[PDB]
Amino acid sequence: FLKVKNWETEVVLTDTLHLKSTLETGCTEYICMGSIMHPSQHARRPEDVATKDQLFPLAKEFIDQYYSSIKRFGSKAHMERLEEVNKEIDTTSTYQLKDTELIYGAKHAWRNASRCVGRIQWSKLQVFDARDCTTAHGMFNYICNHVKYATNKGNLRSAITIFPQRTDGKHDFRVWNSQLIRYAGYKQPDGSTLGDPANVQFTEICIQQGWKPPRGRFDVLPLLLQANGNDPELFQIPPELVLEVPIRHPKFEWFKDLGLKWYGLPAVSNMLLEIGGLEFSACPFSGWYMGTEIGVRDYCDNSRYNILEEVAKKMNLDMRKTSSLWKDQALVEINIAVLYSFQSDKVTIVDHHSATESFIKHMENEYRCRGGCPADWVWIVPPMSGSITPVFHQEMLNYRLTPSFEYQPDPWNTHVWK
Amino acid sequence: RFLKVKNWETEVVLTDTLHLKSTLETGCTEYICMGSIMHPSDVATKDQLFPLAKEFIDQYYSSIKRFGSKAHMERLEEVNKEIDTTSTYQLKDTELIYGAKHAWRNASRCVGRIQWSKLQVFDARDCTTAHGMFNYICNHVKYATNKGNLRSAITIFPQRTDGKHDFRVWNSQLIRYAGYKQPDGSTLGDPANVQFTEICIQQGWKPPRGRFDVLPLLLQANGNDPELFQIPPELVLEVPIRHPKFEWFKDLGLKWYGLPAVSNMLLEIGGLEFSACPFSGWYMGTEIGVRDYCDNSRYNILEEVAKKMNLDMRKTSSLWKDQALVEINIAVLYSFQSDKVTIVDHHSATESFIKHMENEYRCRGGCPADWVWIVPPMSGSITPVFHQEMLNYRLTPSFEYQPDPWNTHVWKLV
Numbered sequence: 108f109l110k111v112k113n114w115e116t117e118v119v120l121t122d123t124l125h126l127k128s129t130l131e132t133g134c135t136e137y138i139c140m141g142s143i144m145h146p147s148q149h150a151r152r153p154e155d156v157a158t159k160d161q162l163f164p165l166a167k168e169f170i171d172q173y174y175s176s177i178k179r180f181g182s183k184a185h186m187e188r189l190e191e192v193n194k195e196i197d198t199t200s201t202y203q204l205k206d207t208e209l210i211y212g213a214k215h216a217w218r219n220a221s222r223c224v225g226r227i228q229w230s231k232l233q234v235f236d237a238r239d240c241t242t243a244h245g246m247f248n249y250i251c252n253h254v255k256y257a258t259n260k261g262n263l264r265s266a267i268t269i270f271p272q273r274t275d276g277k278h279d280f281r282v283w284n285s286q287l288i289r290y291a292g293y294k295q296p297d298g299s300t301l302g303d304p305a306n307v308q309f310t311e312i313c314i315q316q317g318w319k320p321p322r323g324r325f326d327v328l329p330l331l332l333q334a335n336g337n338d339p340e341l342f343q344i345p346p347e348l349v350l351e352v353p354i355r356h357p358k359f360e361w362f363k364d365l366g367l368k369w370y371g372l373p374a375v376s377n378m379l380l381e382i383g384g385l386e387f388s389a390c391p392f393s394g395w396y397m398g399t400e401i402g403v404r405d406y407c408d409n410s411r412y413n414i415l416e417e418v419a420k421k422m423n424l425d426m427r428k429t430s431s432l433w434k435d436q437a438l439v440e441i442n443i444a445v446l447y448s449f450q451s452d453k454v455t456i457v458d459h460h461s462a463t464e465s466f467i468k469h470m471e472n473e474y475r476c477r478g479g480c481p482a483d484w485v486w487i488v489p490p491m492s493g494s495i496t497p498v499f500h501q502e503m504l505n506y507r508l509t510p511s512f513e514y515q516p517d518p519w520n521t522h523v524w525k
Numbered sequence: 526r527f528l529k530v531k532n533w534e535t536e537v538v539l540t541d542t543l544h545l546k547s548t549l550e551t552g553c554t555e556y557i558c559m560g561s562i563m564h565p566s567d568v569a570t571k572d573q574l575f576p577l578a579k580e581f582i583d584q585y586y587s588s589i590k591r592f593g594s595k596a597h598m599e600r601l602e603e604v605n606k607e608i609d610t611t612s613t614y615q616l617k618d619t620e621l622i623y624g625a626k627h628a629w630r631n632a633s634r635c636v637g638r639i640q641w642s643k644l645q646v647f648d649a650r651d652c653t654t655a656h657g658m659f660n661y662i663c664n665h666v667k668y669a670t671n672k673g674n675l676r677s678a679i680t681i682f683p684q685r686t687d688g689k690h691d692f693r694v695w696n697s698q699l700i701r702y703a704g705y706k707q708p709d710g711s712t713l714g715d716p717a718n719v720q721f722t723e724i725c726i727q728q729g730w731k732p733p734r735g736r737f738d739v740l741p742l743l744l745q746a747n748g749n750d751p752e753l754f755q756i757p758p759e760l761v762l763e764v765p766i767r768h769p770k771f772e773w774f775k776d777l778g779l780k781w782y783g784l785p786a787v788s789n790m791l792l793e794i795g796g797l798e799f800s801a802c803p804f805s806g807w808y809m810g811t812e813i814g815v816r817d818y819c820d821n822s823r824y825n826i827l828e829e830v831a832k833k834m835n836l837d838m839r840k841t842s843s844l845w846k847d848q849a850l851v852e853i854n855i856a857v858l859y860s861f862q863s864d865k866v867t868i869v870d871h872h873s874a875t876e877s878f879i880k881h882m883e884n885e886y887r888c889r890g891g892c893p894a895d896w897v898w899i900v901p902p903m904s905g906s907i908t909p910v911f912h913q914e915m916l917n918y919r920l921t922p923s924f925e926y927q928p929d930p931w932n933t934h935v936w937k938l939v
């Protein structure tokens with residue numbers, strides 16, 4: 108029984124949910140790893156096809172949790188499902204989720220995502236079951252439908268598309284893209300980078316796979332889709348599906364001349380969805396942006412588009428010394444522009460003040476009904492204006508509940524080509 | 526064993542071996558991280574004190590390349606005799622200085638630790654009365670302030686004995702502004718110091734009842750009732766806050782003091798507890814301009830500044846708070862620099878901490894660091910520390926929090 112305190116409101120919450128955590132955080136009583144990006148390699152089953160005594164306990168735990176969730180623990184259907192999962196594992200070394208279980212699992216993986224400030228929405232998730240998919244062409248179809256549904260002409264809707272779970276580890280479904288929609292990055296002859304430097308390696312793989320790069324600053328990358336462990340295949344997302352927002356400023360009419368844009372749909376496609384010991388290595392999910400993700404990280408990280416210098420110049424700021432806070436001043440204007448632009452174009456976006464306030468409300472809801480809410484302060488606090496958002500002053504407990512979204516190796520590090 | 530930390534901006538990877546030398550708890554478990562908890566997770570017996578003391582003496586003599594020396598062994602013998610006969614022991618001056626510097630070096634929440642080895646240590650262990658504490662603190666303030674060219678300093682009062690004779694500075698900082706709750710529910714001055722202001726008034730302080738009243742010192746010697754002292758105003762350097770572009774900013778009437786001097790922590794050195802150990806450095810601008818000025822629970826000036834900026838405050842997505850916050854922090858840095866009062870902006874400070882951290886990994890095997898505290902409260906990811914993975918663990922000597930003295934002091938007069 109742990110208490111968390113909000114140091115602004117003095118609200119104290121009492122956490123009991125953490126008693127159900129399964130995986131190591133990476134911390135010990137002697138060392139905290141809370142700012143380590145990937146602190147733990149503690150997985151719930153070994154790398155590939157578990158034996159029965161390895162997979163069934165995880166399956167039983169999830170089925171138990173699901174039937175508990177619907178007030179049916181020990182019910183006829185609960186005991187049959189256990190027997191059913193038992194026979195499936197006995198005869199196939201794995202088992203297949205029911206549609207209801209898949210949906211429950213996906214929503215709870217989002218609900219359990221301690222790094223996500225958006226989880227007040229967790230039960231409003233549209234789940235696309237793509238477990239019947241067999242080819243990269245089918246994956247492209249599924250992803251196109253996801254993008255179209257989720258974009259919804261700018262009125263974004265949260266969605267996840269779940270491709271067939273891992274079997275032996277050599278037949279993985281993978282979206283090689285880190286997000287469904289991202290811009291290419293190009294190594295320049297002189298040594299600078301054009302476009303998004305984060306995606307230089309992936310872009311080079313696409314180029315080497317036969318993609319014809321237009322070699323601009325905002326080239327939407329093709330999809331690089333791997334089905335059933337085969338070599339990945341390139342697909343161009345129909346551009347009418349890729350909603351983009353030109354970035355302009357409500358006051359600085361020169362801002363539009365910077366030629367900046369961003370896409371409207373944040374769609375993570377490189378993570379692993381773990382449910383009942385089953386691993387869904389291709390499970391692209393999307394919601395809608397918090398403005399700072401684009402305005403602070405995508406635009407202003409030194410290793411990303413790195414636009415602070417360009418914006419500050421146009422603003423006529425004293426960039427000679429750090430103490431003029433010219434980076435801070437330009438940072439704010441950039442984020443004003445990003446929000447103003449999405450809002451002007453009626454593309455769903457949330458500012459970090461509203462998003463963090465919702466997350467506090469979500470925490471209170473979760474403590475009241477669930478007895479806790481795992482939360483990673485290091486990720487929840489926005490990357491600008493931290494302490495003027497409420498989450499900065501909110502103590503959080505971080506712990507790992509299942510089902511979950513997990514990181515996984517980039518496929519080009521593990522894929523043996525054909 | 527080794528642990529690697531990565532910087533995700535530079536891809537520099539550093540290897541921590543120093544964490545193996547911790548034996549104090551972080552508060553986390555193997556299954557729960559308490560890294561964002563402010564305060565996670567009665568005097569030492571003879572048995573408890575012996576190994577704490579040995580560990581410190583061992584590390585002191587290792588630091589000076591005299592481990593195993595005759596002086597090392599005689600010092601351990603001598604420390605053991607004092608603990609055996611007196612239930613405590615006395616640090617040598619060299620050990621006190623070393624211990625104070627390393628408590629700073631070990632302060633995982635402190636971004637300014639590149640300066641750790643240039644600490645002026647004032648040994649006040651001969652002090653016996655609150656008047657003597659006031660004298661020591663005045664000298665500390667004067668030395669540290671240095672007419673605006675601030676110098677890091679700590680003054681160390683007698684260690685805890687039986688826990689019934691503690692020396693304590695009741696102030697949370699040596700220099701802080703009073704807060705007064707008004708009958709209408711508003712607060713004049715600093716709302717964070719309302720409770721301590723009330724204690725001062727109760728003890729006889731006659732308050733000016735203004736917005737920036739420097740608080741009196743409330744000083745406790747030898748476990749006696751604390752006593753009030755007015756810091757001589759000529760020793761309190763203050764900076765009126767103005768803005769390089771907004772002429773109206775000075776009309777806000779803002780000022781701050783130049784000397785950040787924490788006075789409510791406990792210094793632990795080799796099992797010894799120095800419950801009064803005020804220390805001071807210089808400010809990072811955001812401490813004042815973001816937290817002191819713009820916390821909703823503090824001076825909370827965002828609204829007023831945004832109004833004078835004619836910002837649209839009807840919607841949060843105008844980012845009017847963010848825009849006002851930057852200008853306030855510009856004003857803070859401009860004002861201190863104009864008055865030649867030492868101050869460091871969060872970009873320079875975090876950059877220096879990264880260099881410090883890397884140096885520490887190189888020469889010491891690591892640098893315990895609390896990312897939640899190291900990352901500045903504004904513009905987080907445009908400072909390098911945001912992208913720096915850090916390991917947090919507790920090394921000793923250390924600065925520790927301790928309960929506020931008014932919650933444990935049992936009063937004596939009448």
Ligand code: HEM
Pocket residue numbers: 213217220222223224225226228232265266267375392393394395396397400457462486512
């Ligand atoms: C609906 C609006 C949503 C908002 C505003 C939101 C906000 C955020 C933000 C700002 C981050 C940090 C991303 C980064 O710093 O790189 C994040 C991370 C995350 N989100 Fe959400 N999110 C939303 C929806 C979703 C959905 C639908 C899912 C899954 C079904 C999800 C799962 C996650 C996970 C697993 C992470 C951390 C993993 C990672 O990206 O490294 N989120 N979210």
Ligand code: HEM
Pocket residue numbers: 625629632634635636637638640644677678679787804805806807808809812869874898924
């Ligand atoms: C020399 C310039 C220094 C700078 C720029 C600096 C910077 C900072 C900052 C910005 C914080 C966070 C304060 C807060 O958010 O409340 C902090 C905390 C801390 N500093 Fe430093 N500091 C300096 C000197 C020192 C010195 C001389 C000591 C001790 C001898 C020290 C020990 C600590 C400790 C123990 C903490 C965490 C305790 C606490 O306040 O909660 N620092 N420092």
Ligand SMILES: CNCc1cncc(-c2cc(C)cc(N)n2)c1
Pocket residue numbers: 225373374375392393394395396397400
């Ligand atoms: C490693 N972080 C990956 C990443 C990068 N960009 C954006 C997001 C993201 C994802 C989702 C579902 C919503 C949102 N608002 N944002 C995640």
Ligand SMILES: CNCc1cncc(-c2cc(C)cc(N)n2)c1
Pocket residue numbers: 637785786787804805806807808809812
């Ligand atoms: C809980 N933290 C207390 C506090 C409050 N204000 C300022 C500081 C501080 C202290 C020191 C030595 C240096 C600095 N640059 N800042 C510490």
Ligand SMILES: C[C@H](O)[C@H](O)[C@H]1CNc2nc(N)[nH]c(=O)c2N1
Pocket residue numbers: 141142143144485486487533911912913914915
């Ligand atoms: C090292 C540090 O943990 C790393 O830079 C983290 C910090 N907090 C973050 N927070 C969010 N939301 N997203 C991130 O990518 C990061 N990066």
Ligand SMILES: C[C@H](O)[C@H](O)[C@H]1CNc2nc(N)[nH]c(=O)c2N1
Pocket residue numbers: 114499500501502503560561562563897898899
């Ligand atoms: C809840 C959270 O841990 C708390 O608000 C912390 C966050 N980080 C901080 N960081 C610094 N430097 N100073 C602080 O007071 C805090 N407060």
Ligand SMILES: [Zn+2]
Pocket residue numbers: 134135138139140141553557558559560
């Ligand atoms: Zn931890």
